[PDB]
């Protein structure tokens, strides 16, 4: 699956440059959240995790108003 | 090497329940605009305007849908 090994350490939303949310289906039974950081890394995050929900929301708001 | 990935944005009605993937690319040196691309279950990809109020709600709803699966 795309989100087996997720990244578990909190970081500031300012480093997120792209967001991809993939719905669970023919590929994985889990909904995937993948971020591309300014340093080039693509991390899978756990959408149930609270810090992830806050960080993703912050990024979205910024991207929609930038 | 790539530039903007969303020059023209889609505004025709569609069913949000068909959204399978959402991709948000913030503006920067590559593209003056933020791109919101959604891929539907019928294989279509629509670029939507991030400044449009109805688009923000659609994206917001899909996220919530994500963290509650």
**B66:A47 CB<8 A:** yes
Q: Which residue's structure tokens are 């929301």?
A: A57
Question: Determination method here?
Answer: X-ray
CB atoms under 10 Å from CB of B29, counted, come to: 6
Is the distance from CB of B66 to CB of A33 less than 8 angstroms?
yes
CB atoms under 10 Å from CB of A20, counted, come to: 19
Assign a CATH topology to domain B1-69. OB fold (Dihydrolipoamide Acetyltransferase, E2P) (2.40.50)
**B23:A24 CB<8 A:** no
Resolution for this experimental structure (Å): 2.0
- Calpha distance A60→B26 (Å, rounded): 9
Q: Where are the domains of chain B?
A: 1-69
Mutation pick from B26, B32, B48, B65 vs chain A, by most beta carbons of A within 10 Å, is B26
Domain spanning A1-66, CATH architecture: Beta Barrel (2.40)
Beta strands in A16-58 (DSSP E): 16-22, 32-37, 42-45
Q: Closest Cα to residue B36, out of A65, A53, A10, A6? A: A65
């Amino acid at each position: 699956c795309q989100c087996i090994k997720t990244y578990s350490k909190p970081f500031h939303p300012k480093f997120i440059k792209e967001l991809r949310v993939i719905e669970s289906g023919p590929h994985c039974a889990n909904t995937c959240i993948i971020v591309k950081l300014s340093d080039g890394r693509e991390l899978a995050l756990d959408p149930k995790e609270n810090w992830v929900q806050r960080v993703v929301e912050k990024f979205l708001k910024r991207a929609e108003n930038s």
